[PDB]
Design a protein around this ligand. Structure first.
Ligand SMILES: [Ca+2]
Ligand SMILES: [Ca+2]
Ligand SMILES: [Ca+2]
Lengths: 21, 193
């Protein structure tokens, strides 16, 4: 059977405030 | 009970120094203005604290483990960098420096330097010399390399601005400076006031 027809992927990313050093 | 013995009384504690005040736009026009704090780290320099109240009852002192602490009183949305360092030689006066970058660089060059945004907290360690030299506790006198074991300079690297882009000009307060210290006093006495 036809595999991987319309495979979509998701990888969530956060977006904080005040990246500190 | 009438012992004539002298011995170091290493005792620990914490203390509240003062509230810093980021200089803002108006009061910030030149380099020396970027020097918010010039506070000696002599035990007897913070008047109402416990450390100085104790120091008044000895001759000498030596920070075995001292560290200035910054606790912010602002959100993380405001923006300004800060540099802090403790010069172990008091007579090194950066106020004479005009070039701002030269100032920040001679600050960063000091070993115990620290850089932090005024929205988080960090610790400024005092670095101790290697000769065991004790320092006198009383108010500063003819020379300073006897009394002061260090000097805490607090610097404003950038300009102060808010949620929006408009830079503040009102010279607000950002946080407070605490001192988590460990000192050893040698000779019981009373100093004059
Ligand atoms: Ca120095
Ligand atoms: Ca010595
Ligand atoms: Ca004295």
């Amino acid at each position: 059977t036809v595999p991987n027809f319309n495979p979509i992927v998701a990888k969530p990313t956060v977006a904080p405030l005040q990246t500190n050093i | 009970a009438r012992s004539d013995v002298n011995a170091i009384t290493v005792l620990n504690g914490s203390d509240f120094l003062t509230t810093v005040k980021v200089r803002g736009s108006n009061n910030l026009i030149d380099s020396k203005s970027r020097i918010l704090v010039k506070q000696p780290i002599s035990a007897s320099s913070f008047l109402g604290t416990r450390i100085s109240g104790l120091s008044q009852f000895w001759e000498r002192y030596r920070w075995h483990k001292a560290a200035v602490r910054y606790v912010p009183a602002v959100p993380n949305t405001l923006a300004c960098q800060l540099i802090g360092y403790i010069d172990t030689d008091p007579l090194d006066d950066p106020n004479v420096i005009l070039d701002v970058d030269q100032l920040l660089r001679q600050a960063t060059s000091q070993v115990g330097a620290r850089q932090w945004n005024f929205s988080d907290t960090t610790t400024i360690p005092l670095i101790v010399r290697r000769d065991d030299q004790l320092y006198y506790t009383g108010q500063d006198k003819e020379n300073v390399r006897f009394s002061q074991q260090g000097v805490f300079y607090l610097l404003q690297v950038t300009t102060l601005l808010n949620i929006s882009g408009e830079a503040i000009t009102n010279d607000l307060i950002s946080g407070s400076l605490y001192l988590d210290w460990v000192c050893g006093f040698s000779m019981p006495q009373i100093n004059p006031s």
